[PDB]
Ligand SMILES: NCCNS(=O)(=O)c1ccc(Cl)c2ccncc12
Ligand SMILES: NCCNS(=O)(=O)c1ccc(Cl)c2ccncc12
C-alpha cells in the first residue's frame with residue numbers, strides 16, 4: 001500500500017494528482033482539496049539516510065520553522081520502507097513562474113542575493129544535519145556503489161573531462177576544498193524558491209539542507225545565472241550584490257559535485 | 262566502471278547531443294540524442310525489471326519481429342550492461358498523435374485513427390510472435406511486481422472511492438474474474454502518446470515492451486479509456502465501435518482497464 005491506513009484516511013477527500021516526477025527519485029503527489037492544496041512526498045528505502053530521504057527533509061522543515069518561510073509538516077511516517085511526508089503548499093508564486101516571461105535577469109539575481117543573505121543570518125549551532133564534504137562524499141560513494149547516483153548525459157557526452165563517474169569522484173575526493181560552514185539550502189534554484197510582493201515567501205525541496213560551505217549555494221546561483229540568462233556580466237552583477245570576490249576554484253568544485261546527484 | 266552503458270555504445274552516440282526526455286516512460290529512462298542528420302532515442306531499464314513487460318530487451322525483441330509488419334523504430338543497438346538493458350533506436354516517422362490533434366478540433370480523426378490501429382493489429386500474422394501476453398502471463402508478472410513493491414501503487418489505490426482495500430485484493434479479483442481470451446497482435450499500451458500519424462494515416466508506433474499476443478479486447482479497452490478521458494463525449498465511443506463493426510463487450514472492457522491500473 002505504501003502509505004499507512006492513517007495517512008490514506010487523511011488524504012481521502014483530496015483529489016490526487018501525480019506530479020511530473022520533477023523531484024525524482026522522490027515521488028510527489030499534488031492533493032487538490034476544496035480549500036487548499038497539500039503535497040505528499042515519498043522516498044523509498046534505498047534512499048534511507050541520504051540527502052534524498054524525505055525524513056531528512058521533514059527534520060529540516062521543523063527546525064526551520066520560525067527561521068525561514070517553509071511549508072508546514074502535516075504528517076510524517078515510515079511505512080513499509082517508505083518515508084512519507086505530507087505538507088502544506090508553499091506561500092507565494094514559484095520563481096520559475098513569476099519570471100517566466102520576465103526577461104528580467106536583474107530580478108532573479110537580486111532574489112538569489114537575498115536568499116544568500118537570508119541563509120547567512122541563520123544560526124546553525126543546533127542544525128540537525130551537517131552536509132560537510134566528508135558527509136556528502138561518503139553519501140556519494142554509497143550512491144555510486146549501489147547504482148543510485150544520477151549517471152546520464154553529463155557522463156556520456158564526448159566533451160566530458162572524466163572518463164567515468166568514478167574518475168569524477170576521485171577528483172572530488174582529492175580536490176576537496178577547505179570549508180566554512182553556514183546554513184545551506186542544498187539545491188538552490190528557481191524551482192524551489194517562492195516569491196510574494198517582491199519578497200522571498202517560501203522554500204521547498206529541503207532534503208539536502210543543513211550545514212555546508214558558503215560557496216555551495218553561491219555556486220548553484222552562478223550555474224543558474226549562466227544556464228538561463230546567457231551573459232557573464234550578470235554573474236559579475238551577482239557578486240557586486242553579494243559584495244564579495246568570487247572564489248572560482250570553490251565554485252567550480254561545487255558545480256562538479258552536483259553532477260552525480 | 263559504473264557507466265550504465267558500454268564503451269561501444271558510448272562511442273556510437275558520441276556525435277549526438279544528449280537530452281533527458283520528459284520521463285513519461287518510467288520506470289524506463291529515455292534520452293533523446295540530437296544529431297545533425299537525425300535524432301536517436303536511447304531507452305534504458307534496470308535489472309529489477311528483467312523478464313517483465315517493462316524490460317527494454319523484450320521491447321527490442323518485439324521491434325525486431327515487427328520490422329516489415331508494422332511501422333516501428335529501427336533497432337540500432339541493444340546490450341545488457343551492468344544489470345541494465347539498453348536499447349538505441351531511430352526516431353518514429355510522422356507527427357505524434359497527441360500533437361496532430363494539438364489544436365485541430367478533429368475528434369473524429371482520432372477515433373478513425375484508433376479504429377485503423379485495431380484493424381491493422383488484427384491483420385498481423387502472429388504465428389511466430391515472440392511473446393504471449395496472456396492473462397496468466399500478465400498476472401504472474403503482476404504477482405512478481407507486487408511482491409517486490411514494483412507495481413504502480415499511486416492515487417488509484419488511495420482514493421476514497423476505491424473498491425479494493427489494497428493492491429492484493431485487486432489482484433485476487435483480476436485472477437478470479439479472468440475472462441476467456443482470443444489472442445491477436447496487441448500493442449499493450451495503445452494511447453495518443455504512442456501513435457504517430459502522417460497523411461491522415463498511422464505512420465508509427467512506439468512504447469512496445471508490452472506488445473505481443475493478447476486478447477483482442479485489451480487494446481480496444483485502452484482506446485475506450487483514451488476516448489473518454491481525452492475527448493469526453495460518449496458519442497465518439499459509439500462511433501469507434503461503429504467503425505470497428507462490432508458491439509462492445511463491456512464486461513471485458515472494464516476488466517482490461519482495471520488490469521492496467523497496477524502497471
Ligand atoms: N517546483 C515545484 C512545482 N510545483 S509546486 O511548487 O506547487 C510544489 C511541488 C512539490 C512540492 Cl513537494 C511542493 C510543496 C509545497 N509547495 C509546493 C510544492
Ligand atoms: N510520447 C512520446 C513523445 N516523444 S517522442 O514521440 O519523440 C519519443 C519518445 C520516446 C521514445 Cl523512446 C521515442 C522513440 C522513437 N521515436 C519517438 C520517441
Ligand SMILES: [Ca+2]
Pocket residue numbers: 150151152153154259260261
Ligand atoms: Ca548527472
Ligand SMILES: [Ca+2]
Pocket residue numbers: 413414415416417418522523524
Ligand atoms: Ca496505479
